[PDB]
């Protein structure tokens, strides 16, 4: 383990890799976005740019597909999503290396999660805040990447939560070019899979059962070529639920969800859950201070292999 200081003056909220795995973007509550590049020679993380982004705390950022250029989304609590494009004709560590493209002033609530759709669906976005409204923003005009149009507006929650009650939201797209467009949307205690229908509008497709408490993280496993998809969920309970999905009104394919496993090893709240490139190693963080690594056995049962204390 080699710890490197990101340099923020407050709590680092979200860290995301790029597609090539050599750039990391860190957002924080100090109203800053920092992009770190992995040097090939020194093999140490070094800062590329650090610029003020929002007027409130940034909680979710995402890299775009590398075939659409280098675009970083940024969803903060000031009801804005800002899209940032790199112009390489600027000096590093200056604040002008990443140029602003567009502000999405349509969300009436503090945004929690932002996600890009896979590259075969176009340059799409997915926003979710405490207003309970799922918004999809496309990029229709190819001449300028500043005219982003809202296309799908689906309501996840009937009424927004009060300010004193906590809430958490998370999103996960479907990394499958050979399956129709799917979207895993995590409400307060609900997990909904949304599928693109024949009419061009999203519809409710399946619901993941369980989840007696707040869902803290959702993650769709990469389809390496298997016939069943995997969704990993980390709840406010100690459960790392892994859902096995088999795909076969106005929907191109009906899909069935069966719970594959349920692990209580963390003894707390599973804050984050993630997947590998091939869907073989899961990583789960919890209140025990330990990050557990899960791999499937021969009998399709996930068993912990390493525990990393901190």
């Amino acid at each position: 383990m080699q710890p490197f200081d990101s340099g923020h003056d407050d709590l680092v909220h979200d860290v995301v890799y790029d597609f090539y795995g050599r750039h990391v973007a860190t957002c924080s509550s100090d109203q800053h976005i920092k992009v770190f590049k992995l040097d090939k020679d020194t093999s140490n993380w070094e800062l590329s740019d650090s610029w003020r982004a929002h007027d409130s705390s940034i909680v979710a950022i995402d890299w775009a597909s590398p075939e659409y250029g280098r675009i970083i989304a940024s969803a903060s609590y000031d009801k804005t999503v800002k899209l940032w494009e790199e112009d390489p004709d600027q000096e590093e560590c200056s604040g002008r290396r990443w140029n602003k493209l567009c502000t999405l002033n349509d969300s009436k609530g503090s945004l929690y999660s932002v996600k890009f759709a896979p590259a075969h669906l176009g340059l799409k976005l997915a926003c979710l805040g405490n207003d309970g409204i799922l918004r999809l923003y496309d990029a229709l005009e190819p001449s300028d990447l500043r005219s982003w149009t809202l296309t799908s507006e689906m309501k996840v929650l009937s009424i927004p939560p009060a300010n004193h009650l906590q809430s958490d939201f998370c999103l996960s797209w479907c990394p499958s070019r050979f399956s129709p467009e799917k979207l895993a949307v995590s409400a307060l205690e609900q997990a909904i899979i949304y599928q693109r229908g024949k009419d061009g509008k999203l519809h409710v497709a399946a619901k993941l059962p369980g989840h007696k408490s707040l869902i803290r993280s959702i993650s769709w496993a990469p389809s390496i070529g298997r016939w069943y998809q995997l969704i990993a969920t980390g709840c406010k309970d100690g459960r790392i639920r892994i859902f096995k999905i088999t795909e076969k009104a106005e929907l191109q394919s009906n899909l069935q969800v069966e719970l594959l496993s349920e692990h209580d090893d963390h003894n707390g709240e599973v804050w984050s859950v993630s997947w590998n490139l091939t869907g073989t190693i899961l990583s789960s963080a919890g209140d025990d201070g330990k990050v557990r690594l899960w791999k499937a056995t021969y009998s399709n049962e996930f068993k912990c292999m390493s525990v990393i204390t901190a």
Partner: protein, 800 residues
């Protein structure tokens, strides 16, 4: 119990604290070192014991040691710990609150009296020392009961009564505002933003306020029943709610003496008053139960520790663990850990299992290493790569090499039937006529003792076992040179030449092998004696106990002579098992063996079953089970491209191909992706010659200058097909584009590499933002000194 954090006193890293015992009788001054997490870091310094019943406590920031203590009888005592004066109001009554300003001004909150002020503000330097009573400089809040107060500035004080909440400035006799609210109790200003304070009420309802909203009036937040109730009845209440002195927008609440909830808030500006809402709550279980009051301990690197006082009065120190907030995985199997407390980010590179060992043994980094090493492009190269640094992958790539060499040599592709990369099951099991397939198989062979001899010859051709005695001797010599004497002896027994096996294994180095050969020698006479006689018994026991699979095979065949004990264990090559089931077996039992082994390998997902199944739809099912077992989509794709789109079309092969191409892009192996694409194009050639691969479509459709139509609806001179007119000229030399053998050498900025560069520099090249064409060498030589398009009248920096 009251633990109050006191700052502006110590000059070292120590943080001072003041404590009141749960029986409300003494005031204790502590000193806590934050960098040491032991319970011995708390140092008890002094204890003033002459107190009746403490109700409130306050300290002085400017002067070190000056501590005021209120009491229920009415005696306020101002003294030092690191003089001693007792003061009281003109009309004696209980003291609820107390405040000492920075400039030494002292305020006081009293009970309700109809002839006296409950907010007495006075200075101790202008106080007559001969009287216990105080003469106040400023008197406020007559006929009221002030329960909590706090000095905001050097002149303004924020006082809370039983039915009002006021901010009173000493420079004006009229208060700034009065907001009627019932949540008027212990005021804790936010140390990072003075405009925010938080009180609670009699019903336990906590409320975080903003002074500007009250100035102008709703509370900014309201938590129903968060703290202990009964605030009016009891004057000795523990502090179970604290603001955060380590970071902004945070507060800790202690619930039931067991857990501390660290609520973290989020803010947004409606556009300067920040509206607040709850973002995350973190629960920390205490080390010891029954905790009444608690307080923070700021440490280095944004750390947090909590000093807590139990109901028995024991004071201890408890740290806050580093809980990971984000664990993300890379394509290179790299873990990145983000904490909820500090700022630093932890990384475990690939460079109970160890985490580094698991991420180094995962199939993602295995596939990355193989793809960087050049896996799948040439099967002989894969065999050499596997041998140079598990073994079933080598055995299933040896068959791919054999079948590919046989197809590329034209041995199989002749006749009306293709039969390339066909399986033993399909060949031996038959399926436009039986006579037609028999005669075409005969014409393939022309290049018994059984009804189907030509099928056996086809199976030996497919398996690569169609060999003569000289070929077997050459194989023995090759395996002897490679150093696997056990494998050489096993192959010699597979052919059936046991004296040859004895001769091969005896001419070795290792005495262990010479002993093994000596044991095997026995059989050269122990052939006509069917009976238990120890030698067979010991040989069966040794076949059970030896570790080498080939030696296990050789002993199980020598003793208790039976072919079935050789061709059922999976420890040896399936190609070798087919070689011994095709050379010495009856056709009645060969069908049973083939059916059992095929039905085994198809559901097990082993790659060695490609011997039996070939590159067929059943082979695609086998590869699908292999993927479901291992997620080795790299080997699945590199095996599937050997005849999936050439012979059929299934969605699973295209899915594996696209997945491997995306992974190769993610590892930045663009050269290997290009090699995979050209291999897919080369292996999709049909028997006629028609390509079946879904190649990349065209990206350039040049419009002709003369005819004004598409030129794509000549290896050295490209012209428009509609009218013959050539391409647009270069912008540097005004010569036509797309033609080689130029009368000059474009020397743009190992002589073979230089010649390739000189012949590459004369290619087509155009900017996609202004549409002006150049030679490649012309652009390379021209953009090293200029930064504008060379065409006149164009303003476009084509370099960047």
């Amino acid at each position: 119990g009251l633990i109050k954090k006191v700052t502006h006193w110590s000059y070292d890293n120590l943080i001072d604290y003041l404590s009141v015992n749960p029986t409300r009788d003494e005031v204790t001054h502590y000193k806590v070192d934050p960098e040491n997490e032991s319970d011995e870091s708390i140092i008890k310094l002094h204890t003033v014991k002459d107190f009746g019943s403490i109700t409130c406590l306050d300290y002085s920031e400017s002067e070190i040691g000056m501590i005021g203590v209120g009491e229920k009888n009415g005696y306020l005592r101002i003294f030092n710990i690191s003089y001693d004066i007792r003061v009281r109001a003109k009309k004696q009554r209980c003291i609820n609150s107390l405040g000492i300003n920075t400039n030494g001004l002292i305020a006081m909150g009293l009970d309700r009296n109809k002839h006296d002020s409950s907010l007495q503000i006075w200075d101790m330097n202008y106080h007559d020392d001969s009287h216990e009573t105080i003469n106040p400089m400023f008197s406020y809040c007559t006929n009221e009961s002030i329960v909590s107060l706090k000095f905001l500035n050097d002149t303004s004080v924020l006082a809370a009564s039983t039915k009002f909440l006021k901010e009173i400035d000493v420079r004006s006799p009229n208060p700034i505002y009065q907001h009627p609210t019932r949540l008027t109790y212990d005021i804790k200003l936010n140390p990072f933003n003075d405009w925010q304070f938080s009180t609670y009420g009699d019903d336990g309802t906590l409320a975080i306020w903003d002074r500007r909203k009250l100035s102008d009036a709703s509370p900014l937040l309201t938590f129903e029943k968060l703290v202990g109730s009964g605030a009016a009845s009891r004057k000795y209440m523990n502090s179970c709610f604290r603001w955060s002195c380590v970071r902004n927008n945070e507060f800790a609440t202690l619930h039931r003496g067991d857990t501390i909830k660290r609520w973290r808030l989020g803010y947004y500006c409606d556009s300067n008053i920040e509206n607040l809402f709850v973002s995350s709550v973190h629960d920390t279980n205490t080390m010891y139960d029954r905790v009444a009051t608690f307080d923070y301990i700021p440490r280095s690197n944004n750390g947090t520790s909590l000093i807590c006082m139990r109901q028995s009065g024991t004071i201890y120190r408890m740290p806050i663990s580093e809980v990971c907030s984000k664990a993300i995985l890379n394509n290179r199997n790299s873990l990145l850990l983000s904490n909820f407390e500090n700022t630093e980010i932890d990384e475990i590179r690939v460079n109970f299992w160890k985490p580094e060992k698991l991420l180094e043994k995962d199939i993602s980094v295995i596939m990355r290493t193989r793809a960087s090493l050049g896996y799948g492009l040439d099967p002989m190269n894969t065999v050499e790569m596997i041998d140079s640094s598990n073994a079933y992958i080598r055995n299933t790539w040896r068959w791919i090499a054999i079948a590919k060499a046989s197809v590329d040599d034209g041995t199989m592709v002749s006749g009306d039937l293709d039969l390339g990369y066909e399986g033993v099951i399909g060949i031996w099991n038959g399926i436009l006529s039986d006579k037609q397939l028999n005669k075409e198989m005969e014409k393939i062979i022309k290049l018994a003792g059984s009804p189907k001899y030509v099928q056996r010859r086809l199976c030996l051709i497919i398996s690569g076992w169609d060999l003569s005695r000289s070929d077997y001797e050459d194989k023995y010599n090759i395996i002897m040179k490679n150093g696997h004497y056990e494998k050489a002896a096993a192959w010699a027994v597979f052919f059936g030449d046991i004296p040859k096996a004895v001769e091969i294994l005896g001419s070795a180095k290792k005495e262990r092998l010479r002993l093994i050969a000596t044991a095997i020698a026995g059989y050269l006479a122990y052939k006509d004696l069917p009976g238990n006689n120890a030698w067979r018994q010991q040989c069966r026991k040794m076949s059970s106990e030896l570790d080498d699979p080939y030696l296990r095979v050789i002993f199980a065949f020598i003793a208790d002579n039976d072919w079935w004990d050789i061709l059922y264990e999976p420890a040896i090559s399936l190609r070798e098992r087919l070689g011994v089931a095709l050379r010495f077996l009856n056709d009645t039992d060969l069908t049973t063996f083939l059916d059992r082994t095929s039905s085994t390998v198809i559901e097990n997902g082993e790659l060695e079953g490609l011997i039996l199944t070939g590159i067929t739809p059943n082979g695609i099912d086998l590869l699908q089970s292999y993927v479901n077992k291992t997620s080795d989509v790299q080997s699945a794709a590199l095996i599937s491209i050997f005849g999936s789109p050439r012979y059929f079309r299934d969605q699973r092969v295209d899915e594996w191909i696209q997945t491997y191409r995306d992974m190769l892009k993610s590892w930045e192996l663009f050269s290997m992706r290009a090699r995979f694409d050209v291999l897919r194009s080369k292996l999709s050639r049909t028997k006629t010659g028609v390509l079946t691969a879904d190649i990349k479509p065209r990206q350039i459709y040049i419009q002709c200058q003369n005819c004004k139509q598409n030129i794509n609806t000549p290896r050295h001179k490209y012209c428009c097909p509609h009218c013959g007119s050539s391409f647009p000229r270069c912008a540097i030399c005004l010569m036509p584009l797309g033609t080689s053998n130029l009368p000059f050498v474009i020397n743009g900025t190992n002589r073979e590499l230089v010649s390739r560069k000189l012949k590459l520099n004369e290619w087509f090249s155009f900017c996609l933002s202004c549409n002006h064409g150049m030679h490649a060498g012309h652009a390379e030589e021209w953009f090293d000194r200029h930064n504008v398009c060379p065409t006149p009248g164009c303003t476009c920096q084509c370099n960047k």
